Amino acid sequence: FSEEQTAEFKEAFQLFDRTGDGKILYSQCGDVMRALGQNPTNAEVMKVLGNPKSDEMNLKTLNFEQFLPMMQTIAKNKDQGCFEDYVEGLRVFDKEGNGTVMGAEIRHVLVTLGEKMTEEEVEQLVAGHEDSNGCINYEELVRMVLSG
């Protein structure tokens, strides 16, 4: 793309370097990509990561040179799952349509479906929004995640 935002790109890239030169682990560089708004599933990440294995992902880092075509391929997605998707799917995921969605079921179907995440991930995700009813307003959290 352009050098317009490549300055912020460079400072962020070197910000999370464990060696301080421009070599950042594959897991870490994917995490930075996700932190840069561009948050795709690890599937297409590995697809554009040369289809490596977990060992290579945790041993092999990446320079900033190849990082530009990498976010280029990421920008080729040009879109992700929409907001109406999430709101309607969570609305139809509840048991009674009571403006909210139960918490434990959400945690379970999040850590045990499709892309796997640890329990504390979804825990600190839902953390703060808990209620005595256990039914969190999916709308506020989904719009916070989308906008944030």
What does the binding site for other proteins look like in residue numbers (CB under 8 A)? 18-20
Q: Which is nearer to other proteins, 16 or 93 (CB)?
A: 16
CA–CA gap between residue 69 and residue 86 (Å, rounded): 30
Q: Which is nearer to other proteins, 14 or 41 (CB)?
A: 14
Could you tell me the smallest distance in angstroms from the CB atom of residue 91 to other proteins?
Answer: 35
Could you tell me the smallest distance in angstroms from the CB atom of residue 102 to other proteins?
Answer: 28
Reference 49, options 36, 34, 61; nearest CA is 61
Residue 142 CB-half CA count within 13 A:
18
CA–CA gap between residue 40 and residue 33 (Å, rounded): 9
Could you tell me the smallest distance in angstroms from the CB atom of residue 11 to other proteins?
Answer: 13
Q: Which is nearer to other proteins, 20 or 97 (CB)?
A: 20
Could you tell me the smallest distance in angstroms from the CB atom of residue 131 to other proteins?
Answer: 23
CA–CA gap between residue 148 and residue 144 (Å, rounded): 5
Q: Which is nearer to other proteins, 12 or 102 (CB)?
A: 12
CA–CA gap between residue 141 and residue 58 (Å, rounded): 32
